Each structure stands twice: as C-alpha cells, then as structure tokens.
Amino acid sequence: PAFDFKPFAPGYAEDPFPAIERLREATPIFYWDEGRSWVLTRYHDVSAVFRDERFAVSREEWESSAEYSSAIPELSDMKKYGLFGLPPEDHARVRKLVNPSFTSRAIDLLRAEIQRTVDQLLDARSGQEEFDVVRDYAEGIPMRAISALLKVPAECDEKFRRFGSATARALGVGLVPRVDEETKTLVASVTEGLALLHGVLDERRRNPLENDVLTMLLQAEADGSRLSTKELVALVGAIIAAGTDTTIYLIAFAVLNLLRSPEALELVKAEPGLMRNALDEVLRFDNILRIGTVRFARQDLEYCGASIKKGEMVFLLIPSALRDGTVFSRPDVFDVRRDTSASLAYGRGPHVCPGVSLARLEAEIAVGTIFRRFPEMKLKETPVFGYHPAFRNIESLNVILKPS
Numbered sequence: 001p002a003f004d005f006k007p008f009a010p011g012y013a014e015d016p017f018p019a020i021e022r023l024r025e026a027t028p029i030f031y032w033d034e035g036r037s038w039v040l041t042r043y044h045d046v047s048a049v050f051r052d053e054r055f056a057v058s059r060e061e062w063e064s065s066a067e068y069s070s071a072i073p074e075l076s077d078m079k080k081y082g083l084f085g086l087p088p089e090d091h092a093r094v095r096k097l098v099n100p101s102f103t104s105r106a107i108d109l110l111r112a113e114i115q116r117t118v119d120q121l122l123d124a125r126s127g128q129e130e131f132d133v134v135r136d137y138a139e140g141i142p143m144r145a146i147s148a149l150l151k152v153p154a155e156c157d158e159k160f161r162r163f164g165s166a167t168a169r170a171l172g173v174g175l176v177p178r179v180d181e182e183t184k185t186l187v188a189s190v191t192e193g194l195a196l197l198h199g200v201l202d203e204r205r206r207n208p209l210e211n212d213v214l215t216m217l218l219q220a221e222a223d224g225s226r227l228s229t230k231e232l233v234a235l236v237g238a239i240i241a242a243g244t245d246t247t248i249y250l251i252a253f254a255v256l257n258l259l260r261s262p263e264a265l266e267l268v269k270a271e272p273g274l275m276r277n278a279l280d281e282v283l284r285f286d287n288i289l290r291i292g293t294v295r296f297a298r299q300d301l302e303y304c305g306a307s308i309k310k311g312e313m314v315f316l317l318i319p320s321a322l323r324d325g326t327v328f329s330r331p332d333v334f335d336v337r338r339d340t341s342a343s344l345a346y347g348r349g350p351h352v353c354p355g356v357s358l359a360r361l362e363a364e365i366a367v368g369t370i371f372r373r374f375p376e377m378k379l380k381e382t383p384v385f386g387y388h389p390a391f392r393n394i395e396s397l398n399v400i401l402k403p404s
C-alpha cells in the first residue's frame with residue numbers, strides 16, 4: 001500500500017491518477033523507497049504543511065546544508081539568496097517589495113503585447129501543413145511576457161527561455177534521481193543567462209525608467225536597503241525560471257483538455273467568461289506537476305504517524321491532493337463550472353505564487369484566441385510526454401486547425 005511509487009515510469013506523465021489514487025486511499029502519508037523523503041497524498045494534510053511554520057523550504061534545515069555547497073556551484077547565490085534560500089523574515093521583506101508589480105491590475109498593461117505575440121505565432125504557421133501547440137505555439141509565449149515586464153527586446157527572448165528551462169531542471173537536481181538534459185550544456189545555458197542578466201541590470205542602472213520593475217528593485221537595494229545585489233539578481237532569475245515551463249504546460253494542458261472534453265469546450269464557447277474558471281479547473285483536474293512541492297523538516301515530529309528526521313525532505317503530492325474526493329465532489333471529472341477556490345495549484349502561505357495573475361492572463365489569451373479562430377480544431381496523434389524531473393512535460397501536440 002505505502003509501497004511502490006514510479007513517478008518516472010513510462011505512461012505516468014500521461015495518466016498518473018490510477019496509480020497515485022491507491023497510495024492516497026490506503027496511506028495518508030508514506031515514505032518513498034529511494035526517496036529518503038516522506039510523501040503526503042491527502043488534501044488537508046498537504047494543505048496544513050504549506051501554512052505550517054514547523055516546516056521549511058530550504059537546506060539550512062535539511063539533512064545536508066553542505067549538499068548544495070556542491071553540484072552546479074554556479075547557482076549557489078541563487079539557492080542561498082533566492083526566494084527559497086531566504087530565512088522566513090528576509091523572505092517576507094522581498095515579497096512585499098515585489099508583490100505590487102504582480103497584481104492583476106498592474107500586469108494588465110501587458111495585454112496588447114501578448115495578443116501581439118499570440119497572433120504572430122498563429123499567423124505564421126496556419127494554412128501550412130500541421131501545427132504543434134507546444135513547439136509552434138506555447139513555447140513562444142511565456143518568455144515574451146516576462147521580457148515585456150522587465151522591458152527587454154524580443155531579441156533576448158530566445159536566450160532567456162533557454163535559461164529558465166535549464167535552471168528549472170537544474171535546481172531540481174537534488175530532489176530527484178534523473179534529468180532530461182545534460183550537465184554540460186545546461187551549465188552553459190545558466191552561465192550565459194546570468195551573463196545577459198548582468199548586462200540588462202547595468203543598462204537599467206544606467207538608463208532607469210519610470211514605473212518599472214527593475215528600476216524599482218535597483219533602488220530598494222542601493223536605497224533604504226530592503227534588497228541586496230545578491231537577493232536581487234536571484235530574484236529576477238527565479239522569476240524567469242519559475243514562470244517559463246509552468247506557463248507552457250498550462251497552455252498545452254488546457255488545449256488538450258478542451259479537446260478531450262467536447263462538453264467542456266461547448267460551454268466555453270457559449271459563455272467565454274468561463275475560460276478563466278476553466279483554466280483553473282485544468283490545473284485542478286490534471287496538474288502540471290509530477291510529484292508536487294518540497295518541504296524540509298526543522299525539528300522531529302510525527303505528522304500523521306511518522307517520526308521524521310530533523311532535516312528530512314517531504315514531498316506534497318499535489319496531483320493526488322487535487323483528486324481528493326472529500327474536498328471535490330466527483331473529483332475525477334473535468335468540470336468547467338466547478339468551484340475551484342480550493343485548488344492548491346498556485347500554493348498557499350508566504351510563498352504562494354506571485355505569478356498567478358500573469359499566468360492566467362497569458363493562457364486566457366493563448367487558449368481564447370486559438371479556439372476562437374480555429375473552432376473546428378481537432379487532435380492529430382496521441383500527445384507525447386517527456387521525463388522532466390519537476391513536472392509531467394508534454395513535448396508534442398499536433399492538431400488540425402480546420403479539417404477536410
């Protein structure tokens with residue numbers, strides 16, 4: 001019961017539910033075989049850990065703090081001075097410093113730009129031959145959004161996406177046995193990223209702008225002292241890496257689920273206003289993650305029958321927690337008219353996702369346009385699923401915009 005767990009077993013990133021259900025039903029918390037980290041699977045236990053001050057997100061309360069003083073020494077300052085490397089206090093400070101630039105009203109100004117990119121991708125490979133929603137559509141949206149936000153030209157767009165992808169899989173190199181890319185190039189992508197990032201920051205420092213996120217941050221460091229070089233460059237790099245693949249897999253999953261559910265798609269056609277809720281149910285019904293989010297214990301305790309090593313890692317199994325029958329009625333149903341307030345897709349507590357509104361705005365316009373301009377769009381072949389350490393990645397998704 002509390003036994004097996006094959007989060008990399010082929011056919012899991014396509015349908016991990018039938019398997020992860022059983023762990024859930026039986027054991028409210030097991031101990032992943034090779035993992036040396038427990039694995040919570042139930043909703044109310046998963047949630048409580050989030051807003052729980054007894055747990056931590058960092059390594060200075062791990063089994064080894066000197067485990068990240070090794071392997072990829074280049075992201076050192078990003079793990080120590082980044083959003084997951086700041087002790088609780090320091091983290092509250094940087095968040096309130098940055099949160100306001102992420103409110104839905106603040107990012108709203110990025111609509112025309114995003115639509116703009118959304119049309120170029122569409123109207124540049126339509127009436128061609130075939131269309132891959134990942135490679136020809138999603139992959140090209142998220143970096144353009146963040147670039148517009150930091151006010152970087154569309155030329156740096158390719159460079160930065162390669163940087164965030166690399167970084168996301170690399171920072172997860174201590175939490176999971178395998179990876180999708182190789183340490184050689186991956187390391188080049190990170191170094192080359194920090195490189196550009198340092199040029200971008202020197203120029204903004206030189207030519208500051210009004211009502212601007214980098215400008216603002218550059219002051220709060222060299223002014224009043226609420227932010228520091230380290231915590232800053234870390235901050236920007238985290239943001240890119242944290243909101244690159246995630247948004248890609250939201251957009252992709254959504255199209256897939258609107259193709260896998262004509263009921264659902266016939267409702268978002270009748271009342272577009274559902275699209276915002278639909279996209280939230282997409283993460284609820286079928287989460288982009290593989291295992292979840294990670295918390296390290298600070299001091300021994302026995303959460304639901306389990307004494308844990310002061311420093312021992314714990315995974316919050318987010319795909320299953322969102323399939324919890326006691327919280328969501330008919331939980332194995334993709335229902336666009338459902339109440340999704342309880343979703344934990346974007347987390348809970350002090351580290352709740354600051355990119356939530358941006359992510360919704362991007363997919364709202366990504367998913368809304370393509371369907372509206374290609375309503376008869378149907379799937380082509382079965383969708384392929386890679387082996388990313390952090391989440392169920394979908395490498396391919398081809399469809400026919402208008403059959404015949």
Ligand code: HEM
Nearest residue numbers: 083239242243246247250293345346347351353354355359
């Ligand atoms: C579909 C899109 C996205 C999803 C599903 C997602 C998911 C999440 C989740 C679950 C967390 C919290 C993990 C924890 O428990 O500690 C998180 C945190 C975070 N997210 Fe997002 N995210 C998305 C988009 C974005 C975007 C677009 C950005 C930035 C532009 C972003 C930036 C961040 C950052 C910087 C954190 C660190 C929080 C902290 O400790 O300060 N995310 N995201």
